Design a binder for this molecule. Structure first.
Ligand code: NAP
Ligand code: NAP
Ligand code: MG
Ligand code: MG
Lengths: 401, 401
């Protein structure tokens, strides 16, 4: 008899290679054990295009309603993808949108396995990213300037006052952009990182470029220090774990040089880049969990990598792939784990935790996709294609479940 | 008889630990061999403060006049430094300013030594950063919004037309920022990177976040592809070296995973962060050269790291330091090498090239500062303080010069 679910998972379907893998994961690792209850939204590019991105919006709202989302990597359009898919427009990141609607903090952490040695010598313990989910460049407005004139950054009070600053005097074509974040949102971001480093029992690092961005970045600096001063210093000193702030360039540099083991808070953009640096450096983009947690307690689970286009094209040429499903497995089990917790289905959480251990265990035993092949200390090794990796995880799981 | 110079070097003095080292390098490694001809500008924070940052400006102009600058790491002020130094204001980055005035591209590359093994397993050859020296956040305007109202990005043609886009509707205090770059400048940046990868005989990678920043970043993408299409494809295919564009998150990820050996072009901000990632990951922030090259042919040599505040404070407490001078040595020899080339003083260029080899050679032989101690494959090792490192380089140089 399959495991039964109460509240539905919001399920958001994706693109290209992850879309393929999303289906294989449901059919081989989930549906045979759980009567999967989800509310389906197809965030595939083709469907986002048919519904003029309305589906993305509805899927956000549904996460708010039911409380947990799991989301497949999707394509974010640019001139190339507009051409490739004949899009009505260059749609905004659906992750940007969902994130804007929920607010919150995306937590990303490698998926560790004993016999998988990181590229960076001396990385002995996981490094977590705590990425601010809201604003900055993900909510920019930009403008191409066609020839000479005047760019201005402009604010108009609810009262009367206006201030204008000059962005630049063009005597030629170039680009401009404006963007924003809100203290409310920084404040949630800072508490979320502090909470999280405690929950994890580690130092929190935070970093920006406050010396160059003297008010915007400088705000994030201040709010963190404030929130730390009179809201966490106490609990922190208590556990003997420090809060560490430095310049973003300095921070990457010390990260590379550390043994890992800290939580690393980053503004939106930096969190994007650094979650790729850290997953890759730990082993593979696929070996990393990602969950958005809204201030208001809602969750979206995802992969941190994108849609593996390159692999997708190879698959379309008829080649076989070796694409690593770990991150999207873990998104499903993360989401199912949380669904269970909230609805009091112990069988769902033990299922999820067991499925997670089977997965890691499978790689520990030397069966893994190409991306890990060269990091493994396992003598006898078995590099498998995309499907076989999943069949093999299923084997190890069934034998221990 | 000391070596004689023709045109003066523009010399820009710095702060804290680099200020100390700048003097030790002149006195032990330069002045005893060269009648040093320079035009001195003190970009120390205290002097920038006394002259209300005018000295920074004059030093830029002088680089333009004479053609080569060498520059010590300087402090860029923030609320903390305003307090620490009782500044009349939070002065703008002097590097930002000089860079804005010259335009150009900052090239940074590790300083390789056989027996110094990078932190990132598999980095077998240098990775170079080619950082756009101009604009974006280094020329931002920012504004704190105090409560509700309307932020707008605004452009006004030289003609009549105005366009306004809404940055955001605040009903609360937060931050906003606007910034720009110009096609002229992107165009020079792109040719500079292409030239440079040829001069180096390697693939050029370039990357941004064009899917999210759909016009601004997307412009950089386009201009690179254009300039490549009909200005370098030919020379490139010719040498069997490819031009590679991907998303910035994807790019860090593939970098970590590559064997190095490419030139990696980055927008201003990203070039800052990534030059720290790469120097650190190669060994130390100190083991990296940096030179701005203006479109109009002018050069500023510098360290890529900052002023080593932490070491400075330790030195002030009376502790001895082990601060690595390599990068600022190399700035001086880079600058002297170029001065020589331009003025036809072969003795100056051979001096500089010899001084560079003595330095590397010294570390090859196992004498080095703390930051390298743990990367060295040299059996018998001699970790020295800041001064001794310099005396030891002097020894090895004198014996081969
Ligand atoms: N929805 C999202 O969270 C998300 C995230 C990032 C990008 N995007 C979208 O995804 C599309 C492609 O982006 P991208 O190519 O830059 O990044 P990507 O999908 O993360 O793929 C980057 C590369 O890293 C390796 N890799 C990533 N995931 C892997 C996995 N599961 N198994 C094995 N190898 C893996 C592959 O490298 P090799 O080819 O070297 O084997 C892959 O080509 C873009 O259109 C972008 O908009 C979506
Ligand atoms: N003018 C510039 O190009 C420049 C560049 C960056 C920063 N800045 C300014 O410099 C000040 C300090 O910035 P920061 O502390 O972030 O960066 P930093 O001066 O580069 O120092 C960062 C850390 O990296 C290690 N390191 C850097 N250079 C070293 C060297 N030559 N020898 C041995 N170790 C070295 C040291 O680490 P350990 O303490 O771990 O030993 C140092 O504390 C800031 O006020 C900033 O505005 C200037
Ligand atoms: Mg990403
Ligand atoms: Mg820097």
């Amino acid at each position: 008899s399959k495991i039964k679910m109460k509240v539905p998972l919001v399920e958001m379907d994706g693109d290209e290679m992850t879309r393929i893998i999303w289906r294989l994961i449901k059919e081989n690792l989930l549906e045979p054990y759980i009567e999967l209850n989800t509310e389906y939204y197809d965030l595939g590019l083709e469907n986002r295009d048919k519904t003029e991105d309305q589906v993305t919006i509805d899927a956000a709202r549904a996460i708010q309603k039911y409380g947990v989302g799991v989301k497949c990597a999707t394509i974010t359009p640019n001139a190339q993808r507009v051409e490739e898919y004949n899009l009505k427009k260059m749609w905004k990141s659906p992750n940007g949108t969902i994130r804007a609607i929920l607010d919150g903090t995306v937590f990303r952490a490698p998926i560790v396995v004993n016999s998988i040695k990181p590229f960076v010598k001396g990385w002995k313990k996981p490094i977590s990213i705590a990425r601010h989910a809201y604003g900055d460049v993900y909510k920019n407005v930009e403008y191409y300037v066609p020839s000479a004139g005047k760019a201005e950054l402009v604010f108009t009070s609810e009262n009367g006052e206006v201030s204008r600053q000059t962005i630049h005097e063009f005597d030629g074509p170039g680009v401009i952009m404006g963007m924003h974040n809100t203290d409310k949102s920084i404040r949630s971001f800072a508490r979320a990182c502090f909470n999280y480093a405690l929950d994890m029992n580690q130092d929190l690092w935070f970093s920006t470029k406050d010396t160059i961005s003297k008010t915007y970045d400088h705000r994030f600096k201040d709010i963190f220090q404030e929130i730390y001063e009179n809201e966490y210093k106490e609990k922190f000193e208590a556990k003997n774990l420090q809060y560490f702030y430095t310049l973003i360039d300095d921070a990457v540099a010390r990260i590379i040089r550390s043994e890992g083991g800290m939580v690393w808070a980053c503004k939106n953009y930096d969190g994007d880049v650094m979650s790729d640096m850290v997953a890759s450096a730990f082993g593979s983009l696929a070996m990393m969990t990602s969950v958005l947690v809204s201030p208001d307690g809602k969750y979206e689970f995802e992969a941190a990598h994108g849609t593996v286009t390159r692999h997708y094209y190879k698959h379309l040429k008829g080649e076989e792939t070796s694409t690593n499903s770990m991150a999207t497995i873990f998104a499903w089990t993360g989401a199912l784990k949380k669904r269970g917790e909230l609805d009091g289905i112990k069988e769902l959480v033990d299922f999820a935790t067991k499925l997670e251990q089977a997965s890691v265990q499978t790689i520990e035993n030397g069966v893994m996709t190409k991306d890990l092949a060269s990091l493994s200390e396992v003598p006898e090794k078995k590099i498998v294609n995309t499907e076989d990796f999943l069949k093999e995880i299923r084997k190890t799981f069934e034998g221990m479940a």
